[PDB]
Amino acid sequence: MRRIVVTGMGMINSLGLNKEDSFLAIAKGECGIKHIESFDASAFPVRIAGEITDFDPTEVMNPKDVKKAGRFIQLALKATREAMKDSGILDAHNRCPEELANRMGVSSGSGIGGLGNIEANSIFCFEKGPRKVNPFFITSALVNMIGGFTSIEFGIKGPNLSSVTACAAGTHAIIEAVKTILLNGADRMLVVGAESTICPVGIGGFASIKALSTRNDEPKKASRPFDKDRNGFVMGEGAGALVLEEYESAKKRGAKIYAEFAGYGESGDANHITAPAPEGEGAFRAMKMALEMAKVEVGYVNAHGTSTHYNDLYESIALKNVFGSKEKVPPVSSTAGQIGHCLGAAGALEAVISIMAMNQGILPPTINQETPDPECDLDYIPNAAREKQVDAVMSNSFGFGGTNGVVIFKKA
Amino acid sequence: MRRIVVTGMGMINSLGLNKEDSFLAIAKGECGIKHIESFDASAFPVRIAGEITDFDPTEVMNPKDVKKAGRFIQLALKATREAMKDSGILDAHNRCPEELANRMGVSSGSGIGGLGNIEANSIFCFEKGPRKVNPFFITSALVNMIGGFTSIEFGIKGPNLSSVTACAAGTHAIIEAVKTILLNGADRMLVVGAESTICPVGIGGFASIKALSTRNDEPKKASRPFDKDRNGFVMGEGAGALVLEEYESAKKRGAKIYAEFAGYGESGDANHITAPAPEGEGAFRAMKMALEMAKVEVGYVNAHGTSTHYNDLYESIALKNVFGSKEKVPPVSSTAGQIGHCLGAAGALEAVISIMAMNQGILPPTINQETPDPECDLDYIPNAAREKQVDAVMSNSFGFGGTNGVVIFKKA
Amino acid sequence: MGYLMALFEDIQAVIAEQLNVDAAQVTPEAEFVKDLGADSLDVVELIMALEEKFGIEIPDEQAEKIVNVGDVVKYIEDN
């Protein structure tokens, strides 16, 4: 079986414009959740979000093209540029070498993609008729246009694939990339999860099902995974990106090796469209298959942990059941307190975060742990980051429709 | 070398509610394109579509649940129910047997999913605020809710995956299911591509880029792949579904065997966001990879063939290049004349059509062939079906962003 | 003639911002794809922004025959 390594990483979120500044702020327990400014939320039951306020699209694409890409794609071009440069793979023109281009693909993930663009053109069409629908509407909004713009930007011509499994999309995009390399459909895969849905119909959609925290007065305390006072997730925007390469190809070209891919698991609950399976049953199966595949001792778990009553509970139950007991669960944290839950991008952001934790021996903490929840009785690395060497990390993602994905990376 | 077979099929489109009626009408060269009636298109530049007018959602769903699902999901439930029933897998309660359930997953595909739902809720929030956003909006629009609703309806708990690669999503959904079974992640997969976007902003989006035929006076003559007088595609709605099954497990069950999976190919153009690569180069590579995996003689090609100038031209060039010469191209037909081009569902529909063509020794024709295009010089089975037995079939799909997918099925 | 010239100035301004180019290159003999770096998508969006900035409405078939900026200006002139 082919072995796979991570050779390049990048990420952009509400606490940093690159993976270095972002992880530092996350390990310090800072919080990027702010009062919403990207639209007028004054009349909304939810007025906070993990917004990025220092992102400039004209730094990643020329001004003429900014209009052609939804914000989630602008964020994806930023993160992939970092990862592609980090990997050392680009040639003198910042393109993938031609003799390698056919064998390097892209696997992208998002839950809905350019929602704000659908929303805007929907309103244009309703108020002024179809002739006011901008020509750049469609390709600015489709989720797979992440792989569209990124493949044109870097000239990669391998399998061009897109996962749209809701809040697990970013983790499934990693796994589909792994599957493609394992079956010799590519030697390298750019992986990127990206989501930006802080817009009126985006916030209202999750508010109307009471999924979001309404602690509007304290944006920095709203997102509190596993805490007894958690009252819904806080929506974040961002993108995370990885370069995966077959192990021998990375060695031959002298690649930086952040981690080796170890194992994955995918399952469905077949229970409910938004609620998790009882006892996190589907999550348990995905987690067990990834652990049985990786066959390594996991020292750290980055939980999905969206700070909602039912997710955080049923994820904790599933973790105890898979590791046998609460005492056998490795240190766990959710970084959704710091940057919000970034939906389809979360799986990708949290794989970058998790590998960096391993690289640095620094396990970031679950912030805003103020009141223990007796039913959430794991070690959530509360408030303070933990200095600890680990040899393997596991990241969990679950999505509406009951779809579960788990990945395990191990030390190189 | 896990071998993989098709053991059940279903489809719904503008020419029928099940695969028998639909394929018969398609092979006879009927046409399901009609004037748009599902919204008021009287002020639109494009007023024709492949609308399904005899579909009753209450026949597939409890009437109370219809409101919970975008139309594309309703069509997916119709097609998957037909294929599941067709497979003989279901127990007395029309659910997957509990001891097979963990190893049967679902691979779904769509380009945008519930666009009409997003458009409607976007207008509600804009005119009357976020309190007017329906709580069923998100779970009725997300693309992966195809897999969500179907996995719940059939009790299938394996990998729950979703592809959003635009007009290639249906074919990529087949390929992800194949890869999953090849890597032993499942023994059976339900595959379904589904799309329903005949709504103001969906039609407006494609007319804004001048991709749609404006032959409004003659709906049944507007869709004419490879014809010299083609002038854009006609949007269709529908869903196709397949049950894939590892071969030994199918034989043990006594399953019927429609076909055996033989090969696939995936590539990206890395060229343009809507136009194909020069000479259909990405299509060429995807077709070449599929053909070299299958190692069979392909006797029929269901072309992507949308009735656009660029696609039909560059698909013909890439076909000629991959088989060697015009004479060495197998019989080729596009069925988009008959049912419209169905976007994310096209690849799933067209795999069902291709396999049925194999089963019955009847190759359906490319209709409305009235004026030969000198640049489109292949054998397109013009106007009338051709009675000819074949031992393998190939189906092509290409999408915005330059993403290509090809699959080959062989007789079994 | 002066009215035509002012119309041409406005059209040139609109084309410049859309394609992100100087008013220098947008001369009556300039081709959108060859001389201004625009693709079909850029062109249809330029045509839209001219219909909105000038309140006009170019029918589908006219926009078909648009090669140089002179073509656009002369259509807007027939009006």
Ligand SMILES: *P(=O)(O)OCC(C)(C)[C@H](O)C(=O)NCCC(=O)NCCS
């Ligand atoms: P421009 O000359 O690029 O025109 C834009 C349009 C929308 C015409 C575009 O190039 C086009 O025709 N794109 C797709 C053609 C097609 O059917 N492709 C198959 C994948 S959708």
Ligand SMILES: *C(=O)CCCCCCC
């Ligand atoms: C996560 O599973 C909740 C839904 C994510 C969809 C994308 C954001 C609208």
Ligand SMILES: *C(=O)CCCCCCC
């Ligand atoms: C096909 O490639 C065209 C775009 C994909 C479907 C989008 C539906 C709005």
